[PDB]
Amino acid sequence: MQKIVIVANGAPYGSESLFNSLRLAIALREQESNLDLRLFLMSDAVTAGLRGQKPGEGYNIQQMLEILTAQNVPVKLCKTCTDGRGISTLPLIDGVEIGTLVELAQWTLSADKVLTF
Amino acid sequence: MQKIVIVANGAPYGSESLFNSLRLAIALREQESNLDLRLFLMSDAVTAGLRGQKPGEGYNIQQMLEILTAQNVPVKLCKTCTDGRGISTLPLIDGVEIGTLVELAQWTLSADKVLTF
Amino acid sequence: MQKIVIVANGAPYGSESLFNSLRLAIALREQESNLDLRLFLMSDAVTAGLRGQKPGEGYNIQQMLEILTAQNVPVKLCKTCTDGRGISTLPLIDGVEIGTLVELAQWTLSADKVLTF
Amino acid sequence: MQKIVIVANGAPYGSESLFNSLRLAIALREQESNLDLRLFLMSDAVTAGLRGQKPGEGYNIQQMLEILTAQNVPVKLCKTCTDGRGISTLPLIDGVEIGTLVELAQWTLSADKVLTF
Amino acid sequence: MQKIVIVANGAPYGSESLFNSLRLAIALREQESNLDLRLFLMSDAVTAGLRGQKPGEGYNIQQMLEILTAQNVPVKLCKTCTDGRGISTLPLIDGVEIGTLVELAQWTLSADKVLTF
Amino acid sequence: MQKIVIVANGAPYGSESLFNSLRLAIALREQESNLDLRLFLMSDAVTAGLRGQKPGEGYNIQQMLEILTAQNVPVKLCKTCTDGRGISTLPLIDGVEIGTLVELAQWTLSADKVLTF
C-alpha cells in the first residue's frame, strides 16, 4: 500500500503554505481513495487544530481538517509545540490528536513518500 | 510625554520576530517609566495572547506579555485575526484584550513613532 | 495634515503581510480623509500592481489598491523590482505607477511616520 | 528510470527557495539527461512564469526555466494561483503552462520522489 | 538500509525550521542506527556550521550538529552559499564539510526519500 | 537634525529584506548628507557583519556595509544574537560593532522615526 506523510510547519491563515498542504492532502485522498495518508503539524501549524475557527474571508482550515479527519486521515500535532503555545488542554478538532517527534520519525521511516510543507 | 506603538505580526515561537518586538518593548518601558507604549498584535501573532503557554526551553512569550501588562501597557489582539483562529472566546493573558483595526488606525495616527514588527 | 508612508514588501496572497498593510492603509484614510498617505511597493509586493486579479475566494488585492488610488493615494512600484519580474511593461492596476528607491528615500525623509510592512 | 516531482511555493527573487529549486532541477537533469523531471509551481512561485524578466542584478529565473523547458521538462503553474494574481492571461515563458491541483495530486501519487521547496 | 536525504534552508535560531529539521534527523538516527542519513545545508542554513556557538537560551544547534556527525552522519554546507557568506574559510563544527550542489544532485538521485525542511 | 533608525531582521542573501535595508539606508545617507542615521541588526541579520563575503552573484552585502560605515553610520550587532551564532568572536567588518538591546531602546527613544525590515 502507498504510504504518504505530509508534515506542515506554516501557521494557519498567515502562510498560504499550510493551506496548500491541506489542499494537496484532500486532493491526494480523492484521486487514490485507498492511500495511507497521515499528517503531522509542527511549530506554528499546530494552532490549526483549534475548534471554533470562524474565518470571515474565504477558506477555513478547520473545515479542511475535518474533511480529512472524517475520511480517517490521522492528523497529529507536535507535543512540544502545542505545549509551548498552550493548546494541549484546549478543545481540538475531532480526528486531530497530540503526537510526538518520535512518532513523526516512525511515519517518516515507514513512509514511501514524505512531502514537507 | 511620548506615544509609541508597536505592531507584531509574526507567530509566537515560530520565529524570533514576535520575540524581538516584545523584547524591545520591555526595554523601552524599562528606560522610561511613564512612556505611553501600546502593543497591537495582528495576524499570526494573535495566538500569543493564549494563557496556557508552557514552553520548556528558552523564552516565554506569555511571560513577556505579563511583564508588559502589569506596567499597565495596553496589549490588543486584532478582532478579525482572533475570530479567524478561534481565540476570541478562549482565556487570554491578563491585561491582554481584543481590539479592532479601527483602534490601530486611531492609535497610529496619534502616535509619535510606530514600530511595525 | 500629517505625512504617513507605508511600505509593503510581501507577495500578494502569499501572506497577510501585504494584505494587512492595505487594510491598515484603507483604514487610516477613513479616520482622516486629508491624510497625505503614500504607498510604496518593494520586491515581491510589486506584482500586486497587476491587473486581472480574480481571487478564487477571500480578499482581492487589486480592488483594495483601487479603493486607495481612487482617493488619490500614491501607489508606487519600485523600478528595479518591476524590471526583474517583467511587471514594468505589463498593464498596471491604474494609478499605480513605477517609482524609484530615490523617491522612497525622500518620502521617508519628509514623512512623519514610516509604517514598514 | 525514475520520476521526480519538484514543487515550489517561493516568490521569484524575493526568496531564495525558488532559485534553489531551479538550480537543483537543472542539476538533476545534468546528472541524468533522461531523468523524468516535472516542476510544479504553487502560490507565489507562479509569477516566475512571466516573460520579459530582466534583472540587472544576479540570477535570472526566466533563463533557468528556459533551460529546463528546452529539455522538455514540464513546468506547470497552478490554475487557482495564477488566476488570483491575474497571470493566467499573460504571456508565459515558452514551455511554462497552467496546471491544476488535481494534476499535482497525481504527479505526486505516481512519482518515486517529490522534492518540495 | 535506507537512503534518506534531509535538506535545510532556514537560518539557525531565526526560525524553528532548521531546528526541527535537525531534531527530526537525530530522532531518525535513534530509530534505525544503520540508516544512510545525509544532511545538506543551503542558503542561510549554511551558517549553522560555525564553531563556538554559545546560546544562553534553550536549544543549541551546534550540539545537535555534533550529535549527528558523531553517529557518522554526513553534513555538507553548500559551497556557493558559504563563499558568499564568508563562512567557507572559518572554523567549522567537528564533522561538517563544504559540499556542492552537484553532490546534492547525486544524493537525491540515489535516495529513497528526500526531506526538505 | 533628523534621527532615523533602521532595524534589520533578515538573513543576508537568503532574502531581499536585509538587502533593501542597506540600500534604502545608503539612499537616505546620500539625499540628506546631514542626517543622523543609525543601523541595528538583530537575529539572522547579525551574520551580515562577518568579513570575507565573496558572493559570485549579485549584490555584495559586505560592500554595502562598508559604504555606510565609511560615512560614519553606526552599525551595531545585537549582543545576544551574535553570542548564539558565534559571531561575537569572529572578525567583524570595518565599522561594524557589537551592540545591545538597551542601546537600541535608547536609539528608538531619541529617534524621529524608526524603520524596521
PDB file of C-alpha atoms in Angstrom, chain B residues 7 9 42-44 78 80-81 85 101-106 108-117, chain C residues 2 4 15-18 20-29 31-32 35 112-117:
ATOM      1  CA  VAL B   7       2.785  46.141  15.911  1.00  0.00           C
ATOM      2  CA  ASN B   9       2.663  40.274  13.016  1.00  0.00           C
ATOM      3  CA  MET B  42      -2.204  41.171  14.227  1.00  0.00           C
ATOM      4  CA  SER B  43      -2.352  38.087  12.016  1.00  0.00           C
ATOM      5  CA  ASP B  44      -0.242  35.134  13.233  1.00  0.00           C
ATOM      6  CA  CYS B  78      -6.956  42.157  16.367  1.00  0.00           C
ATOM      7  CA  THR B  80     -10.792  39.531  12.994  1.00  0.00           C
ATOM      8  CA  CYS B  81      -7.488  37.734  13.395  1.00  0.00           C
ATOM      9  CA  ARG B  85      -8.259  31.241  14.549  1.00  0.00           C
ATOM     10  CA  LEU B 101      -8.409  47.717  13.073  1.00  0.00           C
ATOM     11  CA  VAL B 102     -10.250  50.972  13.783  1.00  0.00           C
ATOM     12  CA  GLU B 103      -8.362  51.182  17.081  1.00  0.00           C
ATOM     13  CA  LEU B 104      -4.944  50.616  15.458  1.00  0.00           C
ATOM     14  CA  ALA B 105      -5.591  53.349  12.891  1.00  0.00           C
ATOM     15  CA  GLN B 106      -6.732  55.518  15.784  1.00  0.00           C
ATOM     16  CA  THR B 108      -1.197  55.055  14.683  1.00  0.00           C
ATOM     17  CA  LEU B 109      -2.414  58.492  13.689  1.00  0.00           C
ATOM     18  CA  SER B 110      -1.989  59.968  17.192  1.00  0.00           C
ATOM     19  CA  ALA B 111       1.399  58.289  17.759  1.00  0.00           C
ATOM     20  CA  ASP B 112       4.893  59.762  17.615  1.00  0.00           C
ATOM     21  CA  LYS B 113       6.523  56.532  16.488  1.00  0.00           C
ATOM     22  CA  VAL B 114       5.106  53.338  15.066  1.00  0.00           C
ATOM     23  CA  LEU B 115       7.480  50.386  15.107  1.00  0.00           C
ATOM     24  CA  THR B 116       5.898  47.855  12.775  1.00  0.00           C
ATOM     25  CA  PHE B 117       7.390  44.459  13.627  1.00  0.00           C
TER      26      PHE B 117
ATOM     27  CA  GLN C   2       0.287  64.651   8.532  1.00  0.00           C
ATOM     28  CA  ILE C   4       2.448  58.920   6.597  1.00  0.00           C
ATOM     29  CA  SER C  15       0.921  36.176   3.198  1.00  0.00           C
ATOM     30  CA  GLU C  16      -1.302  38.514   5.222  1.00  0.00           C
ATOM     31  CA  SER C  17       1.744  40.774   5.250  1.00  0.00           C
ATOM     32  CA  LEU C  18       0.709  42.860   2.219  1.00  0.00           C
ATOM     33  CA  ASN C  20      -2.664  43.866   6.404  1.00  0.00           C
ATOM     34  CA  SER C  21      -0.637  46.782   5.037  1.00  0.00           C
ATOM     35  CA  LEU C  22      -3.600  47.625   2.786  1.00  0.00           C
ATOM     36  CA  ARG C  23      -6.264  47.137   5.453  1.00  0.00           C
ATOM     37  CA  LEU C  24      -4.288  49.487   7.667  1.00  0.00           C
ATOM     38  CA  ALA C  25      -3.858  51.838   4.717  1.00  0.00           C
ATOM     39  CA  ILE C  26      -7.558  51.947   3.835  1.00  0.00           C
ATOM     40  CA  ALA C  27      -8.497  52.269   7.500  1.00  0.00           C
ATOM     41  CA  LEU C  28      -6.160  55.250   8.101  1.00  0.00           C
ATOM     42  CA  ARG C  29      -7.788  57.231   5.305  1.00  0.00           C
ATOM     43  CA  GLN C  31     -10.394  58.085  10.074  1.00  0.00           C
ATOM     44  CA  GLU C  32      -8.957  61.124   8.221  1.00  0.00           C
ATOM     45  CA  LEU C  35      -4.006  62.274   5.242  1.00  0.00           C
ATOM     46  CA  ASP C 112       6.194  61.831   9.899  1.00  0.00           C
ATOM     47  CA  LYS C 113       5.915  58.095  10.338  1.00  0.00           C
ATOM     48  CA  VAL C 114       7.078  55.287   8.073  1.00  0.00           C
ATOM     49  CA  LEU C 115       4.963  52.177   8.618  1.00  0.00           C
ATOM     50  CA  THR C 116       7.047  49.298   7.274  1.00  0.00           C
ATOM     51  CA  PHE C 117       5.368  46.000   6.454  1.00  0.00           C
TER      52      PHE C 117
END
